Amino acid sequence: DRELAILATAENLLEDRPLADISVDDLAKGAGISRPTFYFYFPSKEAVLLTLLDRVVNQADMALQTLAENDRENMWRTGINVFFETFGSHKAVTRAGQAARATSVEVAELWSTFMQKWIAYTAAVIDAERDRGAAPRTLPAHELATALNLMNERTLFASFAGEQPSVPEARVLDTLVHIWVTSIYGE
Amino acid sequence: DRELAILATAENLLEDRPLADISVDDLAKGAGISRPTFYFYFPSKEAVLLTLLDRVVNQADMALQTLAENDRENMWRTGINVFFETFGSHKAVTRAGQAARATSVEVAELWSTFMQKWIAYTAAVIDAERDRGAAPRTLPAHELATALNLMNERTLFASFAGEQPSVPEARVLDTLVHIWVTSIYGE
Numbered sequence: 212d213r214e215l216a217i218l219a220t221a222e223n224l225l226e227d228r229p230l231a232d233i234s235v236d237d238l239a240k241g242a243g244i245s246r247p248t249f250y251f252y253f254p255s256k257e258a259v260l261l262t263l264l265d266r267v268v269n270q271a272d273m274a275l276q277t278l279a280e281n282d283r284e285n286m287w288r289t290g291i292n293v294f295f296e297t298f299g300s301h302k303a304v305t306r307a308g309q310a311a312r313a314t315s316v317e318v319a320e321l322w323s324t325f326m327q328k329w330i331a332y333t334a335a336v337i338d339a340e341r342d343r344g345a346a347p348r349t350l351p352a353h354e355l356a357t358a359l360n361l362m363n364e365r366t367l368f369a370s371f372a373g374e375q376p377s378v379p380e381a382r383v384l385d386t387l388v389h390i391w392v393t394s395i396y397g398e
Numbered sequence: 399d400r401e402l403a404i405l406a407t408a409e410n411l412l413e414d415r416p417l418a419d420i421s422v423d424d425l426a427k428g429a430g431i432s433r434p435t436f437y438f439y440f441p442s443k444e445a446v447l448l449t450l451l452d453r454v455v456n457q458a459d460m461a462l463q464t465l466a467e468n469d470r471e472n473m474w475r476t477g478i479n480v481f482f483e484t485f486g487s488h489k490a491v492t493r494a495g496q497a498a499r500a501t502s503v504e505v506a507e508l509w510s511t512f513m514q515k516w517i518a519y520t521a522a523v524i525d526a527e528r529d530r531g532a533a534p535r536t537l538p539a540h541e542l543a544t545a546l547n548l549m550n551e552r553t554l555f556a557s558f559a560g561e562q563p564s565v566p567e568a569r570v571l572d573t574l575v576h577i578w579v580t581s582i583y584g585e
């Protein structure tokens with residue numbers, strides 16, 4: 212209600228400046244409520260960022276669940292694309308959420324929990340490919356999955372933030388798919 | 399002289415706690431000098447971290463230069479190992495240096511400059527392998543190099559910091575070598 216207005220305001224202002232340059236007053240005004248009324252919905256502007264991150268992460272996670280319930284290069288591209296499209300459609304929340312991992316235990320634990328879930332799912336699919344005889348038994352599945360997932364995190368987020376260096380955003384999906392498919396099917 | 403004593407003290411204390419919990423007084427005492435005498439060597443404790451990072455980065459860079467001046471899987475392992483051994487022998491400087499990228503323009507620009515140099519060198523070697531007919535013309539060399547270099551940054555540093563998730567430090571070199579060799583030589 213007013214909660215959604217606070218979240219939308221925060222996402223809107225995060226496109227213009229860091230969380231340190233947004234005050235509870237900024238969020239309050241944007242949602243058409245007083246400052247004390249803000250504190251009824253959220254204990255802090257940091258709790259607003261945590262909720263936004265939690266929604267984007269859960270949106271990615273549900274999209275990956277949807278794929279899982281329904282050629283091999285395209286299978287991997289469709290999974291990587293969940294993360295490219297989801298985080299890529301919420302760049303300001305991605306950037307601020309990643310920056311808050313340094314200062315918020317709750318942001319670090321949220322990120323850590325979902326990365327563990329996505330790595331376990333990556334490993335399970337590599338194992339299924341190995342059991343069906345399509346992928347060779349090279350590295351331990353979970354170790355290969357961990358490095359591929361951490362590559363995606365750093366490479367996607369560097370591209371979205373226009374970092375130097377970074378893969379251009381128009382080339383990053385193809386770049387990651389090549390490295391996943393060659394490292395999973397290669398010996 | 400006293401400069402080396404300040405640097406050693408800072409590296410020693412960074413193993414115990416973050417830069418925010420080290421004062422110019424801590425560094426001063428460790429080097430056997432007063433606080434005003436500290437300010438003769440360094441403008442700030444942040445300048446001390448920048449100098450430590452600059453030495454570790456230059457040590458990696460010179461070790462890679464040494465390899466470059468002198469089987470293909472082992473060639474790649476020896477290059478990746480420069481970064482594993484160099485940053486892995488200076489874990490506290492690695493952790494604090496990476497954290498300071500968020501708050502120091504000079505740390506961000508140092509990191510960015512050397513990453514660009516290592517990516518350009520990675521691309522040049524992939525191109526040489528393609529020109530000699532050993533590697534296939536798949537992705538653009540510089541884009542493949544960028545993603546592999548960013549994978550190494552995130553995966554090495556997560557392993558060194560014992561992050562959850564992370565590849566165990568005893569498995570990370572083999573993990574990265576597999577992903578480099580399969581993605582560079584694979585189609």
Ligand SMILES: CCOC(=O)Cc1nc(-c2ccc(C(=O)NCCC(F)(F)F)cc2)cs1
Pocket residue numbers: 278279286287288289290291294298329330332333336359360361363364365367
């Ligand atoms: C039978 C269906 O199989 C598939 O759909 C293919 C599959 N893809 C994944 C997958 C998991 C994580 C990431 C990723 O990018 N992690 C990093 C996330 C982050 F946000 F950090 F970038 C990319 C892909 C698992 S299985």
Ligand SMILES: CCOC(=O)Cc1nc(-c2ccc(C(=O)NCCC(F)(F)F)cc2)cs1
Pocket residue numbers: 465466473474475476477478481485516517519520523546547548550551552554
């Ligand atoms: C003829 C000689 O060829 C060789 O020696 C093999 C070669 N290896 C590299 C190489 C460059 C960067 C990194 C790396 O890990 N970057 C990331 C650095 C960071 F610190 F971020 F981890 C790893 C390997 C270039 S060419």
